[PDB]
Amino acid sequence: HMASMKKKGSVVIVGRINLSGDTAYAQQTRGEEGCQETSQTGRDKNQVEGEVQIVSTATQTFLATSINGVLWTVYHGAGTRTIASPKGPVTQMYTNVDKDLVGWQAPQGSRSLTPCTCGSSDLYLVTRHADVIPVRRRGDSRGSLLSPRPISYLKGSSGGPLLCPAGHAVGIFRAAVSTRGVAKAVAFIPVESLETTM
Numbered sequence: 001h002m003a004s005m006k007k008k009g010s011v012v013i014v015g016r017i018n019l020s021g022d023t024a025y026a027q028q029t030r031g032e033e034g035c036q037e038t039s040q041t042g043r044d045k046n047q048v049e050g051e052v053q054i055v056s057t058a059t060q061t062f063l064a065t066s067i068n069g070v071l072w073t074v075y076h077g078a079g080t081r082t083i084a085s086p087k088g089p090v091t092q093m094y095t096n097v098d099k100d101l102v103g104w105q106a107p108q109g110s111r112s113l114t115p116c117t118c119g120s121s122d123l124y125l126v127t128r129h130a131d132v133i134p135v136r137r138r139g140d141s142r143g144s145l146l147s148p149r150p151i152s153y154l155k156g157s158s159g160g161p162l163l164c165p166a167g168h169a170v171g172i173f174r175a176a177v178s179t180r181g182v183a184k185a186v187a188f189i190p191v192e193s194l195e196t197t198m
């Protein structure tokens, strides 16, 4: 009934992938209890840094990537949810279920990646464990892993970036191409598709 209808919580930033130095590593910035609390209130006072955030809902955890002032992630992770911020929940500025794509204004303090114009096919996928995985581009929205690995290692990395050799954003990781549990390839949202949405 109407009196007892629940509201879905916000997406919450719970960590980041540190790419600022010579070593990539994951950092947690909020534990599970604080994530649950922040999800209900939508008020996140933590300072945000970097380009790739680790994000969570009550039931899922995945990634989100800032490109040209927009924090982007996958619809199959975030749905239509708001994101927690220091002033309360922030409504999505982009929602496109057909591309599995959502976006919010980039959090204050984040840093954005620049959309790639290199036209290069030698890419790098960044995972939630701060693995940097070489990927050869194979089409507009597909790339092959130079070294395949079980889908377990990629789970939780949707919304993460594929980067070019110079560190520009080439796309957003969406899905794994899996055969008997091995990821030989990945599907991603090309940055051009983000640039159109903008």
Ligand SMILES: COc1ccc2nc(O[C@@H]3C[C@H]4C(=O)N[C@]5(C(=O)NS(=O)(=O)C6(C)CC6)C[C@H]5/C=C\CCCCC[C@H](NC(=O)OC(C)(C)C(F)(F)F)C(=O)N4C3)c(C(F)(F)F)nc2c1
Pocket: 060, 061, 062, 063, 075, 076, 077, 097, 099, 100, 151, 152, 154, 155, 156, 157, 158, 173, 174, 175, 176, 177, 178, 186, 187
């Ligand atoms: C109504 O709106 C909707 C609703 C639901 C939708 N569900 C969609 O796919 C779902 C979710 C997605 C996924 O697993 N994402 C990753 C991840 O890490 N997720 S996540 O962070 O853990 C988490 C789930 C957020 C927490 C990177 C993966 C890492 C490991 C793979 C595990 C094994 C799964 C293999 C699968 N493979 C596949 O379907 O490949 C196809 C597409 C057939 C191929 F590419 F081969 F053609 C695959 O990857 N996924 C199945 C898609 C789309 F398919 F677009 F993604 N749109 C939607 C639009």
Ligand SMILES: [Zn+2]
Pocket: 115, 116, 117, 118, 119, 120, 164, 165, 166, 167, 168
């Ligand atoms: Zn580039």
